[PDB]
Structures are given as C-alpha cells and as structure tokens.
Amino acid sequence: ACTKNAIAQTGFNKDKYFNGDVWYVTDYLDLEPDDVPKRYCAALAAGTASGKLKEALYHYDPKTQDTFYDVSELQVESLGKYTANFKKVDKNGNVKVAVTAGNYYTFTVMYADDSSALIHTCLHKGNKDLGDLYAVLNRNKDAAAGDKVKSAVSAATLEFSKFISTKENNCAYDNDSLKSLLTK
Ligand code: HEM
Numbered sequence: 001a002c003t004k005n006a007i008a009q010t011g012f013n014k015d016k017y018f019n020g021d022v023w024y025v026t027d028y029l030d031l032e033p034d035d036v037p038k039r040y041c042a043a044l045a046a047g048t049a050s051g052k053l054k055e056a057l058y059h060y061d062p063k064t065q066d067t068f069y070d071v072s073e074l075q076v077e078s079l080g081k082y083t084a085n086f087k088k089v090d091k092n093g094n095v096k097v098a099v100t101a102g103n104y105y106t107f108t109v110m111y112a113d114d115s116s117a118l119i120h121t122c123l124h125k126g127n128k129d130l131g132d133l134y135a136v137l138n139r140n141k142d143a144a145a146g147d148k149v150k151s152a153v154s155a156a157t158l159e160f161s162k163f164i165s166t167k168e169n170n171c172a173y174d175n176d177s178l179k180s181l182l183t184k
C-alpha cells in the first residue's frame with residue numbers, strides 16, 4: 001500500500017511540464033522493494049490533446065524483454081497532483097486493456113525545471129499491493145542528476161544514495177511512438 005502524501009512543487013509550471021516532449025526515468029526509489037531485483041527502463045510523454053491533459057507511458061524490462069505502453073487522461077486534484085486512469089495499448093495506440101475503475105495511478109510533481117524533475121507516484125492495479133515510487137526524470141536519457149534535482153530530493157527528506165539508476169541497463173526507447181500516443 002502507498003503511505004505518502006507527496007507535496008507538489010510551489011509555483012509548478014504546468015505548461016512547461018505538459019509540453020508533449022519526453023521525460024526519461026534516470027533514477028528511482030521504490031519504498032516497497034520487491035523480492036525480485038531486476039533492471040528496468042521507463043519513459044513518459046506528457047502533454048495536452050484537444051484541451052485534455054494526457055500522459056503516455058513506456059515500460060521495458062531489459063532482461064525479460066517484457067514491454068508495454070499505456071495512455072491516460074489525467075484528472076486534476078490540485079496544481080501538480082493528478083489522478084490517471086490508464087489503458088494498456090500497443091505502440092500504435094490500439095487498445096489491449098480498456099480503462100477499468102480501480103486501475104489508476106496518482107502522480108505528484110515535487111520539483112521540475114526545463115530539463116529535470118522529481119515525481120512521486122502511487123499505482124493501484126487489481127489485487128496487487130503496490131507501494132510508493134519516486135522517480136528522477138530528465139529530458140536527456142543519459143544525463144546524470146544535477147545539483148538542482150539532487151537538492152530537491154534532499155529537501156523532501158529523501159536520500160539520493162538510495163536511488164537506483166537505470167543508466168547501466170542498456171535502455172532503448174521509441175520516442176516517436178511515445179509522442180504519437182498522446183493523441184490516443
Ligand atoms: C515514471 C513513473 C512511472 C509511472 C507513472 C508508472 C506507472 C505504471 C502503470 C500505470 C503501470 C500499469 C500498466 C498496465 O498494467 O497497463 C505500471 C506497471 C509497472 N511498473 Fe511502472 N510506472 C513508472 C515507473 C516505473 C519504474 C521506474 C519501475 C521500476 C522498475 C516500474 C515498474 C513497474 C512494474 C514492475 C510494473 C508491473 C506491475 C504489475 O503489473 O504487476 N514502473 N507502472
């Protein structure tokens with residue numbers, strides 16, 4: 001279960017964050033570390049489509065090769081805090097799993113600037129009991145975390161040394177597919 005009520009960045013600039021570009025997860029912290037320790041790759045595109053706030057997600061396990069995409073329409077809880085009901089789709093936007101009540105994630109933008117961000121996310125999916133997940137994002141897939149985001153992590157009373165990096169996972173991303181999914 002999730003246990004944190006993350007606080008959104010004061011003065012969060014929604015237009016800059018939801019500009020349709022891609023964000024790559026470079027480091028993450030799972031508060032409920034599973035028993036199965038494996039590498040992982042994730043990226044997302046957030047933007048507006050016909051006035052609606054949307055988010056496209058990509059998950060890739062470099063070991064098992066398990067891959068999946070998701071598209072969600074976001075609902076606003078407050079500035080910087082959203083609730084997303086996701087639908088699983090293929091890379092072309094074709095629906096594989098329709099939106100289902102009870103299947104959603106929340107996400108809070110704790111810090112963000114033109115190239116980096118720190119977010120908190122709580123996933124709710126079926127019977128699986130998931131926990132809080134923090135992620136450091138960057139507009140560049142190979143960028144080391146800068147002083148700005150590292151300080152934000154500290155300011156949130158978190159220890160960056162505990163975060164797991166995805167840089168050595170040999171990740172590959174289909175940016176074009178991610179961007180196109182925003183309209184699906
Ligand atoms: C950047 C923020 C992320 C968001 C918003 C997010 C969101 C989600 C969503 C919505 C699903 C369900 C997809 C579906 O069933 O169609 C999912 C599943 C999953 N995510 Fe993430 N994720 C993110 C980052 C990550 C990262 C970095 C990891 C850590 C390695 C991760 C590991 C997983 C795993 C293992 C599952 C499968 C869980 C299951 O179905 O049993 N996610 N994620």
Ligand SMILES: [N]
Pocket residue numbers: 123133
């Ligand atoms: N996740």
